[PDB]
Amino acid sequence: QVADLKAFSKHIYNAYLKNFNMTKKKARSILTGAPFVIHDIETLWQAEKGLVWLPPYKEISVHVFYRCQCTTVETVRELTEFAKSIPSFSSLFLNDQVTLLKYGVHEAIFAMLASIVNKDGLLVANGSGFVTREFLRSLRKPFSDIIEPKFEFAVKFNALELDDSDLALFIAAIILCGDRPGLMNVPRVEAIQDTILRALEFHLQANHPDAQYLFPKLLQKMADLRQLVTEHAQMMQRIKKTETETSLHPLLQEIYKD
């Protein structure tokens, strides 16, 4: 079957290249040399006034929080199209497709954020802006609480030096997850995941021949991402409890609803 794994992997890579606005390849060329640097209120206003780029304005920390929601909505759209282009995802009934996306998108999002991140900050607005990690840390709690763990995960994840062909299989494995709550056809999803994981293992052997233990390291990263999302959801719950004037986008209300 191993020669069908290579074609399986290539189909997933093509779904990735077709559907995601930013690749790690493009992002890393931007980050190595230019993006307008957002590092304080004045540069953020500059960036919004046209140099780089929503519910009614509230304050700076809430505004950034709203922009975080907008990127999640847009990435969910891309992840949905990516998943629909995956072998046998769209053969599942639509409710199973929604269940897999509901519980998988944030795990995928936080892994993909690593592609547009270095230790100093984050690419925004199609790579035309760069918002500094220090500026994001300087925001008001509880909003700054959600930021730093994602940088901490991303820097360690980027040390693995994956490329876009690796990430396409990695993201596919995150989505096709058999133990999501309320899944209808568990055996079918488990079977698809096993095929992706076998394809991923085969791909890493060819693409990273000298890398030690890369496949089990990635399996651990998938476990770390589930914990990262658990902690993130807890922080989102505190924001919902304590920041009642701050809006939550309807799509995110449905994702975080129990």
Ligand X SMILES: CCCCOc1ccc(C[C@H](CC)C(=O)O)cc1CNC(=O)c1ccc(C(F)(F)F)cc1F
Ligand Y SMILES: CCCCCCCO[C@@H]1O[C@H](CO)[C@@H](O)[C@H](O)[C@H]1O
In angstroms, give the least distance from the CB of 98 to a copy of itself. 5
Provide long-range contacts, Cβ within 8 A and 24+ apart, for 91-97. Answer: 92/185, 92/188, 92/189, 93/184, 93/185, 95/184, 96/183, 96/184, 96/185, 96/189
Q: How many residues bind ligand X (CB under 6 A)?
A: 21
At residue 38, what are phi and psi to the nearest 5 degrees?
-100, 115
Q: Which partner from the list ligand X, a copy of itself, ligand Y, none does 123 bind, CB cut-off 5 to 8 Å by kind?
A: none
AA identity, residue 63 = H
**How many CA within 13 A on the CB side of residue 183?**
20
Q: Does 50 bind a copy of itself (CB under 8 A)?
A: no
CB closer to a copy of itself, 92 vs 139: 92
CB closer to a copy of itself, 101 vs 236: 101
Q: Which partner from the list ligand X, a copy of itself, ligand Y, none does 222 bind, CB cut-off 5 to 8 Å by kind?
A: none
Strand 36-38, strand 129-132: pairing: parallel
In angstroms, give the least distance from the CB of 87 to ligand X. 28
Q: Does 94 bind a copy of itself (CB under 8 A)?
A: yes
Cα dihedral across residues 179, 183, 188, 189: positive or negative: negative
Piece in contact with ligand X (CB under 6 A), picked from 27-35, 142-150, 160-168, 216-224: 142-150
Give the Cα separation of 250 and 15 in Å (integer).
Answer: 27
Q: Does 102 bind ligand Y (CB under 6 A)?
A: yes
- Coil, helix or strand at residue 130: strand
CB closer to ligand Y, 134 vs 254: 254
CB closer to ligand X, 101 vs 117: 117
Give the Cα separation of 30 and 143 in Å (integer).
Answer: 27
In angstroms, give the least distance from the CB of 196 to ligand Y. 19
Give the Cα separation of 246 and 56 in Å (integer).
Answer: 10
**How many CA within 13 A on the CB side of residue 213?**
4
What is the number of other CB atoms lying within 10 angstroms of the CB of residue 95?
A: 12
| Residues of span 31-50 touching ligand X by CB under 6 A | 38
Which residues contact ligand X (rule: CB under 6 A)?
38, 64-65, 67-69, 71-72, 113, 117, 122, 124, 131, 136, 146-147, 150-151, 154, 236, 252
State the residues that interact with ligand Y by CB under 6 A.
76, 80, 93-95, 98-99, 101-102, 182, 254-255, 257
Question: Which parts of this chain interact with a copy of itself (CB under 8 A)?
Answer: 76-77, 80, 93-95, 97-98, 101-102, 184-185, 250-251, 254
